[PDB]
Design a protein around this ligand. Structure first.
Ligand SMILES: CCCCCCCCCCCCCCCCCC(=O)OC[C@H](COP(=O)([O-])OCC(O)COP(=O)([O-])OC[C@@H](COC(=O)CCCCCCCCCCCCCCCCC)OC(=O)CCCCCCCCCCCCCCCCC)OC(=O)CCCCCCCCCCCCCCCCC
Ligand SMILES: CCCCCCCCCCCCCCCCCC(=O)OC[C@H](COP(=O)([O-])OCC[N+](C)(C)C)OC(=O)CCCCCCCCCCCCCCCCC
Lengths: 77, 57
């Protein structure tokens, strides 16, 4: 069984293309703690502790496009 | 298209400030190494004295 369907983000994808064809600064992040793991100076880690930043940001963007906009009536998660 | 550009844009100001400070530091170091060297040359009085001695005076 193979079902072909689409997500409910096409208009939001269009808006992302329209409003992010040019660069813009980001200063407010839902989960800022992924960028600042170490608080005491002179401490360093040999492990790739900053690998989760990109996934974190993308997950936040995806889940925010879905959940926050779901408050609008008839919007589908 | 979205994330890396935004973080680069966020980086720009601090890097610009630090590089300006670095250039100022280079100029300051260039200035600080300048010293005027005052040379010393043989006093002509000794030359005059040797001339007198050569005369057998
Ligand atoms: C038999 C009937 C037919 C069907 C056959 C099917 C065969 C199936 C085989 C078995 C498969 C088993 C497994 C199936 C699993 C499915 C799972 C699933 O659905 O998950 C949901 C999941 C939903 O994901 P999503 O979050 O909604 O995002 C996906 C979207 O595509 C949006 O994602 P995106 O935006 O990130 O994607 C990138 C997007 C980036 O954005 C864009 O590029 C914008 C455009 C987006 C297009 C795609 C969206 C489509 C919207 C709906 C349809 C649009 C209108 C179509 C009109 C049809 C009219 C009949 O760029 C593209 O999409 C690149 C393509 C652009 C094409 C442009 C073409 C221009 C032509 C110009 C011609 C000019 C000629 C001039 C001549 C002049 C002469 C004088 O689907 C997927 O992830 C993809 C599933 C695909 C699986 C592979 C299927 C096999 C390939 C079939 C191809 C059939 C082609 C022939 C059809 C002919 C007409 C009938
Ligand atoms: C960061 C916080 C953000 C807070 C945002 C606050 C917004 C305040 C909105 C005030 C009321 C607005 C009323 C609009 C009415 C529209 C027409 C209508 O009939 O609506 C009825 C609908 C439903 O009203 P209803 O339930 O009475 O409908 C009755 C209809 N029948 C009888 C058929 C069932 O209105 C809404 O759903 C409004 C809910 C808004 C909730 C806030 C959503 C915020 C998240 C989305 C933000 C999107 C921003 C995108 C920007 C670009 C991004 C790149």
């Amino acid at each position: 069984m193979f079902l072909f369907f689409f997500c409910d983000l096409f208009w939001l994808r269009l808006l992302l293309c329209m409003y992010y064809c040019v660069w813009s600064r980001l200063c407010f992040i839902v989960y800022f703690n992924c960028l600042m793991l170490i608080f005491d100076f002179l401490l360093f880690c040999l492990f790739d502790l900053y690998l989760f930043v990109g996934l974190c940001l993308f997950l936040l963007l995806w889940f925010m496009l879905f959940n926050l906009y779901s408050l609008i009536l008839y919007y589908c998660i | 298209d979205i994330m890396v550009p935004s973080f680069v844009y966020n980086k720009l100001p601090v890097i610009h400030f630090l590089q300006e400070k670095r250039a100022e530091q280079k100029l300051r170091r260039v200035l600080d190494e300048t010293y005027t060297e005052w040379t010393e040359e043989l006093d002509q009085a000794h030359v005059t004295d040797a001339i007198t001695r050569s005369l057998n005076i």
